[PDB]
Amino acid sequence: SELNRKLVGYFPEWAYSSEAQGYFNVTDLQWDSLTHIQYSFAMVDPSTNKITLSNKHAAIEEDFSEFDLNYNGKKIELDPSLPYKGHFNVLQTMKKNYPDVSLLISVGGWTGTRCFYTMIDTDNRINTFADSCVDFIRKYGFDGVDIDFQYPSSTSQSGNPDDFDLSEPRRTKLNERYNILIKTLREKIDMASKEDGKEYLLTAAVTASPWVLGGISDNTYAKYLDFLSIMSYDYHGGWNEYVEHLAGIYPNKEDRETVTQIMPTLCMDWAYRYYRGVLPAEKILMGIPYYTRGWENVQGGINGLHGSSKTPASGKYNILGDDLNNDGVLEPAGANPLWHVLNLMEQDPNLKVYWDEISKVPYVWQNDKKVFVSFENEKSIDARLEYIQNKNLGGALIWVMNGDYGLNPNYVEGSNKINEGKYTFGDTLTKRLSQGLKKMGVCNKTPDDLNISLEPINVDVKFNGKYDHPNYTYSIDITNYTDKEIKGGWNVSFDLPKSAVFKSSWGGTYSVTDNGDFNTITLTSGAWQNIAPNSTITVQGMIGLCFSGIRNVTFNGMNPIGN
Ligand SMILES: CC(=O)N[C@@H]1[C@@H](O)[C@H](O[C@@H]2O[C@H](CO)[C@@H](O[C@@H]3O[C@H](CO)[C@@H](O)[C@H](O)[C@H]3NC(C)=O)[C@H](O)[C@H]2NC(C)=O)[C@@H](CO)O[C@H]1O
């Protein structure tokens, strides 16, 4: 049911054959605790514009004869009656015992967004892609589609730099074309649901970055999603010098990267406020990382935090680093699954865990080597559960499921091998999240905007603007569709998400009233701003920082229903 809490986990297609990933396969998924599994990743084909597999062998061909498929201590065999093998066979086989766990195919990701740029160029290509998604979920027994386009933004040089040859020429239209993509997917998926007697889902994982969001002008697409997953992680990392939290929850005035900003933006709660402009809390999921980022040779800070470093952590502190040329030399990133950091702490008593009571996340600091790594533990899970309950969030998504921890069957005392430590992957944090989501009960239904309860007036209020970080210059066009002049002194109100701060109205007067996740802005015009019948007047002003949209628009205490 719609208001049930959700615990959504991303499954990595590439993990089962990789030492650093722990050889994690579908039978290692936390099936008793997740409500949804997002298979990562499918992509778009450059020549046909259809959904396509990345590692086809892993997805539908691997027989796992060289790997260990077992669950609850019982050997899992591939279902020999299915016309495919691979992860997809194991997913369908497990789902027979977990029929209420929804399976979605995630399309895109950091390295799989490239061909979205050309597929969105025309409506016929979007239609082909959307139809191919329907065919795919039917063929492979999926319950829905997750779109992970990184990113449909005009912000220059956002997304993967390998794709700038496609994204940079398209910046002005990306957001508009993405809105058409999501709407078309919803239309086709809903038709397939009716035809099949099944309730198929459409979701998206979306940016939490104020930098990316400055280039997003239309968040209407959110209304077409079953839920919207905020990527409230990768806030900080080895791409810059700011030794700060990967995935803080609450705004932290000591985050050195944002100390000059209007408010601290690199935390879940800022993105929550941003997206409340277009969605109720129960349709929003918090993103939770089961991986780390970090730095070495950290200068300054306190236990590293708020320090500086031009050298991301390497070596044993970076087992998930990329090998983008080859021969085992990994790009420094301080990137690890949580179980590996636990094992490092077993090995080194001076690698210690600390708690940030402002951001409500932990971190790990080696004071002799000056190594800082982000972390996630039972205390931060508990803080996240508290936030989910307090804010009425729909639940959480997790990147990525092989990073949770449990006891290692292959532990070897004294061994430094990646998969011979005390811990390997497991379900400790995921079970803790699941138990907490069960205990807090279903979400409340957020009430409709109050403007709908007001008496109607045939006035149209259109809110537009332009963003030049950190300044949003708004223009409101007010059209009088009644048969009488509206005298000057009229007022318009709107609810502005608390991701932004109203700064000034350029004409008339204004007031700001606290209203939950919003401030209600009331603009009162001057006596001279009469609105003749069938005419339009425009008023302007300035807002600091960005917001997904405005809500609850009123005019002279009535609901402006236009013409
Ligand atoms: C035009 C201009 O100078 N704009 C400034 C912004 O760049 C800056 O925001 C920061 O932008 C960088 C990218 O240039 C962001 O880093 C990226 O972060 C993502 C994850 O969020 C990571 O995947 C990328 O690898 C990384 N790229 C690079 C090149 O480092 C950074 O997170 C942004 N920080 C914030 C707080 O938004 C803002 C800062 O306010 O200033 C603009 O003037």
Residue numbers in the entry: 47 to 609
Study authors write:
C. perfringens type G, the causative agent of necrotic enteritis in broilers, produces two glycosyl hydrolase family 18 chitinases, ChiA and ChiB, which display distinct substrate preferences. Whereas ChiB preferentially processes linear substrates such as chitin, ChiA prefers larger and more branched substrates, such as carbohydrates presented by the chicken intestinal mucus. Here, we show via crystal structures of ChiA and ChiB in the apo and ligand-bound forms that the two enzymes display structural features that explain their substrate preferences providing a structural blueprint for further interrogation of their function and inhibition. We succeeded in obtaining several crystal structures of recombinant ChiA and ChiB in apo (unbound) and ligand-bound forms to resolutions between 1.30 Å and 1.85 Å. Both ChiA and ChiB encode for an N-terminal glycosyl hydrolase family 18 (GH18) Trios-phosphate Isomerase (TIM) barrel followed by a C-terminal putative carbohydrate binding domain (CBD).
The E196Q point mutant of ChiA was generated to capture the ligand within a co-crystal structure. E196 is expected to be protonated in the catalytically competent state and act as a general acid/base to protonate the glycosidic bond during the substrate hydrolysis. In the first, bound conformation, the oligosaccharide has descended towards the active site occupying positions -2 to +3. The GlcNAc at position -1 is in the boat conformation, priming it for the formation of the oxazolinium reaction intermediate. In the second, encounter conformation, the elongated oligosaccharide is located at the surface of the cleft and only engages the CBM side of the cleft. Overall ChiA displays the hallmarks of a chitinase processing chitin from its non-reducing end towards the reducing end.
